[PDB]
């Protein structure tokens, strides 16, 4: 069975690349500024150093993960004015320069469907009574979009060349012509079925746009990394209110009632319980950050292989045969738009492995012997298109009546 | 109602018990410090980042000597800026872009540039370039070069071992006898 | 090195005991009070081992994650030729060279880099004998003197024959067909 | 001076109080033990590392 017709479809994929950078300060999370509390944690050990060095290392590799994925662009390229490249409407994937937030209309929907501690926004730099803080990333969201806009504008006017090396000027139908050839089919089909391909391309763009406009799911990978880091901090906050088996959860209710000899006994047990929850939170963030780099190592591969090239692996970059790939930005993650090729509408006929002609057995250089009831000819396995059996495309070697399935026909 | 609490167990806002005015409480100031240096070879001045604070209270506590820790030889030096990271002190603002030398936060980096001194600037992503578009022409490479790039990655680790009684006991007899009540934890 | 230094330095931590030395506590205090305070030290020192052992287990996983990457990447590129983009070096991979290292491996990836790009005017097909002649390989270019077919990895002219050009579909179907005569 | 210390706070060398002959102190002896066997199916004899 060999397919005849086809359609192209754009299936999206997401993954996290980034955990939110945290930091803490025992001197504030352990004590709440009690001086005698500060003088009894010393007598345990400078464990504070190990903690600070542990969280900053976990935090610093979140900026490494983000540059490893996005920052594969050597030059920022401008947004071209023409966006109907041969009919291919590219206004949704590109940023809108008429807006103040120069993001793509996809990324507008990507931000909205995705989106206890001190933080500073704007610029109202408020603080909390707890020792927790979140840190803003080095590579800001506008800079993230600026890497993303170069990957899309650069693909729209340089294409295959954009990731392979120096970006080369080339018409977009020519870029399709080399990409469509690369999957094992003849590049006449793009010129033959241009408006059909252009409409099926613009179909799945609007399909993704309406899918992400009304969705309740498919962004569960991104929001889970947001929620899992949020539920670690809530556990870390709420155990401050626990006694940890001491007389009180407040250091100024221990030293108040009890005399300072026995107060420092109860202060030790309240500090030690607060140290263990602080130390375990560091180990939990240490495991979860090592989990995310495996997705960041996937995203670093899947951008340089799929956006900056053309992928030939099975089910990599969606299902089908891969043609293009458009990256999009997400909070703590990336979004891909994989344009794949789907053959369709198969038909039955009878095939054969060899033709006997003048005492020799003839074999196709590529393709199969195709008999549709009328005559024999050769076509390819991914599209039904006849080729007359000549010795130009039929490899000639060996004798007739040796291979199983040699059929008397005529080769011209 | 006499006072309010936050989403944690802390009382963030109180009413005046005398004149009934409602007063928020802010946790006056704290945070971390990083040291931004060009290295001991290239210079001897350093820049400090007072993390996640309003510079109004930082510059006040410098002159009011309300800082812990404090240095005996220290000055603000008329170079203080409030970014999202906090208060960078000891670096001049530069309003153009370069490549990121030492990362600070929120797109801002720093380096030791020509007046040399420590300056703060915004990170550039790359050149303002362009890929022209044609409907008729393809640029095709003619000459070429080769290049050999090296990469490097560990495949092993300095594998260790730890004996218990030379660590937790120091071969004392009493430590070995308490250790029986913990079992084969070793 | 930092993992062993932490394991060393917390031998001298008091952990809230009377001292950090078991010999001081055996000498100074009574066998009840000595046994209490050395029990306080024995659990602080066990926790320091358990923390060290755990963080060795984490970095033993990451190094096995790179060692399984390097054993693949050696088989992919040293023992063969890669076809993945930017895997084993930036550009077009030719071969690679393994070199030993005290705790790892260093590769030397030999890559191809094109340059010196020149403008050429292009079009999809040639309308000869009323037939849309598509290039079997490469693209059609006109250099200002001759129409010919060249590759995109490098510029090299070839005469337009039916051995590197074929027809699927007649003319007036493709937009932009060359109106030239070929062999 | 009376005694020396290592890079960590362990006394590795003591000057003699009587003769002032300075003397290093090594650990007494310790280490791990391993046992080589061809299997109980094959022999009853083992080699010890
Ligand atoms: C660091 O802390 C200092 C603490 O003093 C803080 O300075 C204060 O900021 C607020 C917020 O801008 C200022 O309040 C405004 O001041 C301006 C001019 O003084 C007025 O025009 C404002 O009135 C309008 O705005 C109000 C809120 O938007 C409206 O409710 C009102 O009806 C008016 O329309 C408002 O009074 C305040 O004056 C300063 N204080 C000083 C001494 O400058 C600073 O903002 C903090 N740093 C950062 C980066 O936020
Ligand atoms: C493979 O399958 C695809 C199925 O998607 C098929 O493509 C379709 O072909 C039909 C006929 O060629 C297209 O239908 C027409 O498309 C044009 C495009 O603008 C419309 O304007 C047409 O509407 C007019 O004509 C109608 C019928 O005369 C009138 O009733 C109407 O009022 C309008 O005047 C008409 O819809 C169809 O659009 C495409 N599909 C796509 C997505 O382009 C293709 O032919 C198949 N190929 C093979 C080799 O089997
Ligand atoms: C395509 O690119 C090639 C480079 O990848 C080009 O080959 C280069 O061509 C230039 C001339 O255009 C040569 O330059 C000359 O080289 C000689 C020799 O230099 C060597 O010897 C001296 C003395 O020992 C030493 O000091 C140098 O470092 C070199 O080791 C010089 O004497 C000349 O002054 C001049 O610089 C290059 O040498 C040559 N490269 C190689 C590897 O041969 C090629 O020409 C390009 N082709 C086109 C069509 O553009
Ligand atoms: C555009 O490309 C064509 C080739 O596709 C170029 O034509 C080539 O011009 C060179 C000029 O030196 C010719 O080389 C000479 O040919 C003679 C005759 O065979 C030979 O005896 C000489 O030793 C020398 O090799 C070459 O034949 C010719 N090729 C063709 C197919 O005509 C043309 O010059 C290019 N345009 C520009 C502006 O460079
Ligand atoms: C404690 O101190 C006393 C004096 O400071 C030491 O006694 C003297 O030690 C020196 C060498 O240690 C002796 O010199 C040697 O004497 C022997 C025989 O007398 C001779 O064979 C050697 O060639 C060398 O001359 C010295 O005589 C000796 N004097 C006396 C009165 O005993 C003593 O050695 C120190 N204790 C220890 C344990 O070293
Ligand atoms: C390509 O898609 C864009 C949408 O991204 C189309 O632009 C819209 O056109 C309608 C018709 O006037 C306007 O009402 C909308 O406001 C436009 N959208 C935006 C975001 O401005 C555009 O028309 C499409 N191209 C073609 C040729 O139809
Ligand atoms: C099977 O495929 C062949 C093409 O190789 C078809 O043969 C041609 O059919 C058209 C019209 O159907 C005729 O005008 C040609 O003269 C035929 N050429 C040859 C060489 O036979 C054939 O029609 C197909 N079979 C069926 C049942 O449609
Ligand atoms: C294809 O044609 C050849 C003619 O050369 C047939 O080969 C003959 O087969 C018969 C058996 O039916 C033998 O008795 C002849 O000796 C064969 N001829 C030669 C020259 O060897 C062959 O049978 C035909 N194929 C089919 C399927 O009928
Ligand atoms: C491309 O060349 C063909 C000739 O091979 C041109 O075809 C001629 O078209 C005109 C009208 O456009 C007719 O009057 C002639 O009779 C045609 N020639 C032949 C031999 O039939 C064609 O017009 C050319 N295309 C362009 C755009 O100029
Ligand atoms: C082809 O034949 C197979 C079995 O004979 C059957 O499964 C299938 O429905 C047929 N398809 C068509 C298009 O006739
Ligand atoms: C305290 O007394 C003064 C007058 O002496 C009055 O103004 C004030 O409201 C009183 N406080 C309260 C809480 O009623
Ligand atoms: C130190 O700086 C000098 C320039 O003043 C330079 O020549 C030298 O190589 C540097 N050394 C190191 C170790 O960086
Ligand atoms: C091709 O581009 C040129 C300018 O580069 C333009 O004038 C021309 O109209 C374009 N061709 C078509 C068919 O639109
Ligand atoms: C090719 O043409 C463009 C504009 O048409 C020009 O900017 C570029 O420099 C040209 N390159 C060469 C190699 O001629
Ligand atoms: C190993 O043990 C089996 C019994 O389980 C015995 O039959 C066999 O002989 C033994 N192997 C040798 C080499 O003796």
Author numbering:
A (entry chain A): 695 to 809, 818 to 824, 831 to 1120
B (entry chain C): 549 to 663, 672 to 742
C (entry chain C): 938 to 1120
D (entry chain B): 549 to 597
What does the published report state?
Coronaviruses are enveloped viruses possessing large, trimeric spike glycoproteins (S) required for the recognition of host receptors for many coronaviruses as well as the fusion of viral and host cell membranes for viral entry into cells. The S1 subunit is responsible for host-receptor binding while the S2 subunit contains the membrane-fusion machinery. SARS-CoV makes use of its S1 RBD to bind to the human angiotensin-converting enzyme 2 (ACE2) as its host receptor. Here, we have used single-particle cryo-EM to determine structures of prefusion stabilized SARS-CoV S 2P ectodomain in uncleaved, S1/S2 cleaved and ACE2-bound states.
The trimeric SARS-CoV S 2P adopts two distinct conformations related to each of the S1 RBD: ‘up’ and ‘down’. The ‘down’ conformation caps the S2 helices and makes extensive contacts with the S1 NTD. The increased propensity to adopt the ‘up’ S1 RBD conformation may indicate a difference in the coronavirus S containing the 2P mutations, however other differences in sample preparation cannot be fully ruled out.
